[PDB]
UniProtKB/TrEMBL annotation, chain A:
UniProt name for this protein: Protein translocase subunit SecE
Lineage: Bacteria, Thermotogati, Deinococcota, Deinococci, Thermales
Subunit structure: Component of the Sec protein translocase complex. Heterotrimer consisting of SecY, SecE and SecG subunits. The heterotrimers can form oligomers, although 1 heterotrimer is thought to be able to translocate proteins. Interacts with the ribosome. Interacts with SecDF, and other proteins may be involved. Interacts with SecA.
GO molecular function, one term: protein transmembrane transporter activity
CC terms in the record's Gene Ontology section: plasma membrane
Compartment list: Cell membrane; Membrane
Residues of the full protein shown: 12 to 57 of 60
GO biological process, one term: protein transport by the Sec complex
Keyword hit for Transmembrane helix: yes
Major subcellular location class: membrane
TrEMBL record, chain B:
Membrane-topology descriptor: Multi-pass membrane protein
Compartments it resides in: Cell inner membrane; Cell membrane
Transmembrane segments: 70-97, 117-137, 152-171, 183-201, 213-234, 261-284, 304-322, 360-378, 384-405
Official protein name in the record: Protein translocase subunit SecY
Length: 46, 415
């Protein structure tokens, strides 16, 4: 019980950056999207 | 998935759906602000902001900071997922609930719907408890003037979280219905990222005051980039195997199995079992042992963390050892003429497979275990210690982003 990455293959090994830079601008577009809410739930009340 | 996600936004149905999500998101971050009609909202939090109510540390997070302020999303979207294991426990001992669930998707609606009414009942019990012992028992400690620490306040709060957990529930049932994807998942992941946020801009004016620094705030976040650029290749990893066929449509191509096929399901349910033994002992501030079992498992303390490492690892493996994929697989390799080199059907198709998910989900969920350990070592090493960065709420910072740009692509590869 000690797998060799033998006949093992990944259709994926260059897409790293491109794929990483999407796991980045997805989440660098959620908190701000979340933060656009509290800020706007702050204009009317004030 | 960076230039393509942009051109995926250039598709006015795929594009469209990511906004209705915002519509809820807004209203959801909105629900993320709403006090209790009787809790001195003003006297609820920093009891919960303590090594005594900060044991509540985990509930605040997933809900979305909502617990501390005790918002209508206080419990968040919890009391439907701790009914997702007892039901995943009521799924194999009840050998017909899948037969209901799998003979068309309209036999998992009942499942979903009984899970929902129970998911309203549970969230009427988890509040039925935080009142009976926590807010109430102390007196007018956490509470408004005039209001009674008895039944009428206890009743103005039951409906605060039953149209407050029913609301966050619904937010899933209407994004999933007519907007994009699964409102769920999404709804937990956002709850961490909004708690993984202002501490950052605390940090910069602190990297101004003295307060930590650029280089502790270099090593903590380059780690976050080692998290984006690894987990993915891993999610799109696989072992490819040769087969052949002999002398009526379909596929003849090669068949690979993922090192790890799902990074999410096994890590979520893992956060789950991590909960019950903490929140059962958490509301007893007087008995010294229950106050041990609540601070130990604290996954932001080296031991609970060690148990957090564990549970995230082996839940990967054994949920990477439940569902009916290999059986489904073995049959379509059967009615249509296929086979593996040198390999027989029957028992040496059992032990030739029993060797592999004993070879993959070893190096695999190890990753997920080490994935769970070190931000606390980071939080034993750097400049911040908050239950958010317990390393659980980035796993999905990664994860959600990924599977989205992993199923959107899978949505486009269908038209």
């Amino acid at each position: 019980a000690r797998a060799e990455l033998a006949r093992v293959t990944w259709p994926t090994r260059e897409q790293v950056v491109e794929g990483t830079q999407a796991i980045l601008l997805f989440t660098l577009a959620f908190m701000v999207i979340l933060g656009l809410y509290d800020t706007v739930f702050r204009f009317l009340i004030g | 998935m960076v230039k393509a996600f942009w051109s995926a936004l250039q598709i006015p149905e795929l594009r469209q759906r990511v906004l209705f999500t915002l519509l809820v998101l807004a209203a959801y971050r909105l629900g993320a602000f709403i006090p209790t009609p009787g809790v001195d909202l003003d006297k609820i939090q920093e009891f919960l902001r303590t090594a005594q109510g900060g044991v509540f540390g985990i509930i605040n997070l997933f809900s979305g900071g909502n617990f501390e302020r005790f918002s209508i999303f206080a419990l968040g979207i919890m009391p439907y997922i701790t009914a997702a294991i007892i039901m995943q426990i009521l799924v194999t001992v009840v050998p017909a609930l899948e037969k209901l669930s799998k003979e068309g998707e309209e036999g998992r609606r009942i499942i979903n719907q009984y899970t929902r009414i129970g998911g309203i009942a549970l969230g009427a019990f988890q509040g039925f408890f935080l009142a009976t012992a926590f807010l109430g028992a102390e007196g007018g400690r956490f509470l408004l003037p005039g209001w009674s620490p008895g039944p009428f306040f206890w009743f103005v709060v039951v409906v605060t979280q039953v149209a407050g957990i029913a609301l966050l529930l619904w937010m899933a049932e209407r994004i999933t219905e007519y907007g994009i994807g699964n409102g769920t998942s999404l709804i937990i992941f956002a709850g961490i990222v909004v708690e993984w946020l202002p501490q950052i801009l605390r940090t910069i004016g602190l990297i101004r005051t003295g307060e930590v620094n650029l280089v502790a705030f270099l090593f903590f976040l380059a780690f976050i980039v080692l998290a984006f650029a690894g987990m993915a290749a891993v999610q799109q990893a696989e072992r490819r195997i040769p087969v052949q066929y002999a002398r009526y449509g379909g596929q003849a191509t090669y068949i690979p199995i993922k090192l790890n096929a799902a990074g999410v399901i096994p890590i979520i349910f893992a956060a789950a079992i991590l909960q019950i033994p903490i929140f059962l002992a958490a509301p007893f501030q007087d008995n010294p042992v229950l106050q041990g079992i609540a601070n130990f498992f604290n996954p932001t303390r080296p031991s609970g963390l060690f148990i957090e490492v564990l549970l995230v690892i082996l839940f990967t493996y054994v949920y990477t050892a439940v569902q009916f994929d290999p059986k489904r697989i073995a049959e379509s390799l059967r009615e249509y003429g296929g086979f593996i080199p040198g390999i027989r059907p029957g028992e040496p198709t059992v032990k030739f497979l029993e060797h592999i998910v004993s070879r993959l989900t070893l190096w695999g969920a190890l990753f997920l275990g080490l994935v769970t350990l070190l931000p606390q070592i980071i939080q034993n090493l750097t400049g911040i210690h908050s239950i958010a960065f317990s390393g659980i709420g980035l796993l999905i910072v990664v994860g959600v982003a990924l599977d989205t740009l992993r199923q959107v692509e899978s949505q486009l590869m269908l038209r």
